[PDB]
Structures are given as C-alpha cells and as structure tokens.
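The following block was generated as part of the benchmark described in Methods. Ligand: calcium ion.
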Amino acid sequence: NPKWERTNLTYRIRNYTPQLSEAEVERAIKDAFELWSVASPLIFTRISQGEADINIAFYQRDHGDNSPFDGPNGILAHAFQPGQGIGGDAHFDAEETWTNTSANYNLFLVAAHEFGHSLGLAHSSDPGALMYPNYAFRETSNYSLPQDDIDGIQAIYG
Ligand SMILES: CC(C)C[C@H](C(=O)NO)C(=O)N[C@@H](CC(=O)O)C(=O)NCc1ccccc1
Ligand SMILES: [Ca+2]
Ligand SMILES: [Ca+2]
Ligand SMILES: [Zn+2]
Ligand SMILES: [Zn+2]
C-alpha cells in the first residue's frame, strides 16, 4: 500500500485549460485538496515553479507517460499513486469541456477524485463514494467528503 511518509506536500499547476479563468482553475484545485485535508493529517502547499510532490497538468492524447488520453468524453483524467517523480502526479484531459457548473465535466469533482489516487486510495464500489469509478455531478457549494472516502484516507494515514 503506497503512502506518503510526509504530511506537508507541495503541488504545482504546470498549465491551465482556456475553458476557465486561471483563478477558477486554481480554486477548483485548492478546494479539492481541502476536502482530503479536513479528514487527514495532510497539509498541501502550492508552489509556482520548482519540483513539487504533485504536478497538475492538462494534456492531450499522447503525453509521454504511456497512458494517452482519448479525446472528448471517455477517460477524463488520471493520477499516479504516492511515490517519487511521476508518483502522485495528476493529468487532466485537455480535450474535455471543463466547467465550474453542473454541466459535464466539473473540474473540482474530477480533481477531488484524482487527488484521492494521488494520496493512495483505490476505487470504491460504493456508488455514493467520490472514489467510485464513474463520474456523477453532486452539489459542490459546501461539498463535503462522503463517509466511505473518509474511512478510506483514515485507514491509510489518520
Ligand atoms: C483511466 C482510469 C484510471 C480511469 C479514470 C480515473 O479513475 N481517474 O482516476 C477516469 O477517467 N475515470 C472516468 C470514468 C468515466 O468515464 O466516467 C471518470 O469519470 N473519472 C472521474 C470521476 C469519477 C468519480 C467521481 C468523480 C469523478
Ligand atoms: Ca477523454
Ligand atoms: Ca510526483
Ligand atoms: Zn498522463
Ligand atoms: Zn479513479
């Protein structure tokens, strides 16, 4: 079971999507990390350049990691489990319609999901869990981590 042996982790948004403003992209990512932060001992710090533990980027089709995106819809994003280098990093399919709304696909929800993987969780079979394999929109204002996911991170760290 890979896990980070450190609690203050850094992240870097290497690039953006034109769909949303840069403040909106940064807010989606910030709040997505807060979710896990309030149920665990992890603290996330944003760096603007440099080698962060978790890199966040928007890429298209082939992007040098042997797991290419597939265009609009289908696979939305992917993350790597805790570890060195590529470990912990998260990529979003630049070919998607990324939103701030109920319209497909909400960057905050997808981000929150990916970060679970970046922290070491696997997919849940509970349809109400964030770590459930398929995307579903849920209200995001005042969003809080479903109980199955809390169980999940707590079982890893504490
Ligand atoms: C390539 C594998 C790793 C699948 C990938 C994934 O789980 N990202 O971690 C993914 O793109 N899953 C899609 C599945 C789909 O087409 O619906 C998804 O919606 N991921 C994001 C998601 C899942 C559950 C809740 C919120 C967001
Ligand atoms: Ca896709
Ligand atoms: Ca990394
Ligand atoms: Zn990738
Ligand atoms: Zn997933």
